[PDB]
Amino acid sequence: CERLQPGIVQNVHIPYCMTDWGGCIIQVKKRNQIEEGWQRNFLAAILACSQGMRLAIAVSEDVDIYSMDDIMWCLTTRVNPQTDILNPLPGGRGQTFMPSNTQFEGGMGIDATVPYGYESDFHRPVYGVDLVKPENFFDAKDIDKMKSRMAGWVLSLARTGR
Amino acid sequence: AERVGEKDLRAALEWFRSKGYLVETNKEVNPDLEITGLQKIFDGSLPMLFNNVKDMPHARAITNLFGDIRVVEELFGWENSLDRVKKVARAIDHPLKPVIIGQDEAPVQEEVLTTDLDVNKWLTAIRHTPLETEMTIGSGISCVVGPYFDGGSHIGYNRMNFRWGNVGTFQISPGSHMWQVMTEHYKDDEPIPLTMCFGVPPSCTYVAGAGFDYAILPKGCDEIGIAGAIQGSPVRLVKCRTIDAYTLADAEYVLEGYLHPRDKRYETAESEAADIQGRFHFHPEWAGYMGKAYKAPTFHVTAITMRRRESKPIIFPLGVHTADDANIDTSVRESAIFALCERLQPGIVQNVHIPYCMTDWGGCIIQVKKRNQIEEGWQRNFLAAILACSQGMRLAIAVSEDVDIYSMDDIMWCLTTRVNPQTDILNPLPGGRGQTFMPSNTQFEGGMGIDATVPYGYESDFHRPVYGVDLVKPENFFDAKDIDKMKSRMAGWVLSLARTGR
């Protein structure tokens, strides 16, 4: 992605849950109007140059790329099911382990990014987690009792305030 | 001398003190950007009680009450989330008839105010994000009992903005239960009398978030009938002092008055100066975005009835991108989707989960089990029926029985491996009715039904292998210092995979 157009893709994460060569998540940042639409060129190039990728997801810069509940939040809210799902190579070469054309269905490029210029309509609001301090209200026994029940998406959302 | 509720918020607060789940403080918290700021730090955690609220000498504030779902399930006597879904959907089909008590026995009618009705003097308005301009009351559920709901009852949250004293805006989402009352009585000369209740019993907080499941709970159903059947005792109602309606008797604050559908005003002042709709911020919305201000109808308060101010009545302010708002809105909706799938063909759907990450009405995950060849393909009938009967669902995912439905990395594993992108993606209603908050046909794109299930008979090719996590014991190899050092670095998908051995 830095070879094709540099400065757009900020982070690439492949987790445990997308197997070895099953999928990937990239994170793009659109600086202007010309760079809008470059992430669809990235998802077609990732799914073609990697053999047997089935799920390439492009997300925007305000997403935690390691929190996997944040990726499902972008699939719910930022995905048009008619336009933002790519099937670039239907009948190409996939992987025969994981169940003029073959039986490979094509892969899935999912554009969960925001459009450029519509960032104000899609802006995630930030709560005041830095304007208040929890040490002024509770003692340290009550903080560690309350912080020990937090797991999953709430550890990522309490850090960013999102 | 003093009246006591049956299963109200004060009895639930004493139960949290016995189990050690209640965290209290006496420092003066701010309603401006400190209640929801502390709620976001401790999202999905223990209930926090604020005894001292700034410029609120009689009000107490509870927050994060529905944060952890393990203490909501311990409150109502449920073992897990699978026992929670199957018992509320049992309680939907058998509602309990609510009782009506006298006006001298209702604890919410201890202090009845009929003049100088300043609602911001008595009810606590909060501010969520620092980009807001206005202070928003959003702690009240709307109790409509009687002939305006066809002999049934309705409870559900509505946000307010009191800017003209006793008159404030009343935001109704379109297609809801309050929208169906308002479109029926739009051209009526008489106003609609309703009652907004604050500091409700937590069974009535539970059914308050149920909405857009109207094939199961239609207009004319008993929404406080389900709240009676969840707690096991019928909810006490009482007649209003001024208007001809009914309240919830075991609440803390009750607003009585009339709703004017034709009288519409702007929610914010800066959207009232520039008279447009849909671009100016009010507070955040249910999607994790900002809601915008619109031309909401007006609720004209005629009376404020409230408990005794020396006993310090409790309000429940909550943020909208919190796990309170997830576990209120999506908890009966897990059961109502499970009730719809058991209505269509029973015995197939095992579990329905709606997490925090699929917003309120954004999506759902169901879990099916195909017993034979005839039941194969029934999950595509379920995903089309879920996406049509729930207004504004965008992502319904059906998974098989060998998937952890609560681990969200396990759902992404089914999207990678078990989904054909040509056949297993459903777009059932392209151009139908969606939700206008979350961005002969409309602009709605249709929703997405994703069939991540295995085919019947191909279960051996799609079987997840199980490692021997029960054939070996780690206590025979390492000491207990080395186990807890090694178990403390495990988070995410590896906690689910080490339990099942998958």
Add this chain to the structure above:
Amino acid sequence: AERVGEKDLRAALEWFRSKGYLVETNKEVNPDLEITGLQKIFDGSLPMLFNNVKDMPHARAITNLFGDIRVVEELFGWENSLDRVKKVARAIDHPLKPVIIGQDEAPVQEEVLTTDLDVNKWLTAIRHTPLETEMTIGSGISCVVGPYFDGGSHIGYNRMNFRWGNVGTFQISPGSHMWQVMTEHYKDDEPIPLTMCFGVPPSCTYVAGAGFDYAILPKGCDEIGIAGAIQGSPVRLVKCRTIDAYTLADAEYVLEGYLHPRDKRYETAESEAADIQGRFHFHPEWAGYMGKAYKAPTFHVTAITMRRRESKPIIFPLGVHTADDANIDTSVRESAIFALCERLQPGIVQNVHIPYCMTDWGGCIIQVKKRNQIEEGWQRNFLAAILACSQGMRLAIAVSEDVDIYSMDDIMWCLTTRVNPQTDILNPLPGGRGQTFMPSNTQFEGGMGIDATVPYGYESDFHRPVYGVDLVKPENFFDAKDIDKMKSRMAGWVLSLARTGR
């Protein structure tokens, strides 16, 4: 001496004699190819009563009882088909509790036979088409009351073929109410006791045809509760003499016994010699095709209880491609689709019509009315919800309010003019569950939701102009000889267009 039913078939036959709607004869009709042959000649017409049936010295036969819908609506006190749909859907939500009378007061238990149970000796089997090989009993509805239907009740038709004396086949369509009882108690060692009733009251004939509408009438509902609420009086039940179940007391013949789900036999002899399924004819089916013979479960009759043979008890044989079979199967299904659309968003759908030409469960036509901009697009939510909650619907059409919903040339006019072929054709569930009779996914193609409605705000461009058929009078220009000569050549779309002036 003699027991009298409340609202049974004998009381309905006396009401048809008073209005002149009953046509009787004393010639000996044949059950082989003469009852259904005379039913097809007079399809959609007056009820025909056969006093003498060949090789049936105690049986009387009524046919074409539900043929004309204008005399079904006159029987139950309904003005038209719009009043029929809105009152049965009212009666779905308020069922009447059926009463239980004693065994000495039930008229169907006058003659109880427990030995030499030859069902073809007493119950009339008919043959529809000349390509058949076997004689089929298909006049009985299946009454399951009690713990096998979760405290509710179920009535519905099932075909039989008694070939082994008291043992005959019992065809259950998959996904039905009897299929859900059978899949629950498939591995049970005890058999399922049910009761097949013949010569039922016509309110119980009316709800018998209701099926695959299980979001409205699920398992555990009261299907004889709706039959009590249609006729206005509760249906009398009585305990069986041998088995532990309940019958309908005001019937003419009742078969009592047990259903064996694991014991399965072939329906025909020629499909039993060559042991395949799905190619050999049994009788025609509901689609207007032939049904094929399969491996049906067996109903083991233990007792035959019947009225007194000198009083000549009445059976109701009917063809399956007749207007009896259309107006039995699609009449509560018109109301249940109307109940589902009023559950989702009320006030939009005005009328639901399922004609003869869309078979039983093949299709439906709804009629919507868009009041404002918010209600635009709600009919695509309706067509996706109708096609998913009804199993095996293939053609759901939504039309606007200026269409005659009963004139079928007016529906083809909306397919020509108001349908975009790119946007207004819905395929909601491609690969789901359909019907195997009518020819991770199945072979079902998905159904077809057709949006033939106008957009909101474009009603002036799509307005049908109205000619002046009321501003002129034809009696001022022609005599009454010339009017009735000119009006007798009008049939089809021109009868609907001359009434509305359209």
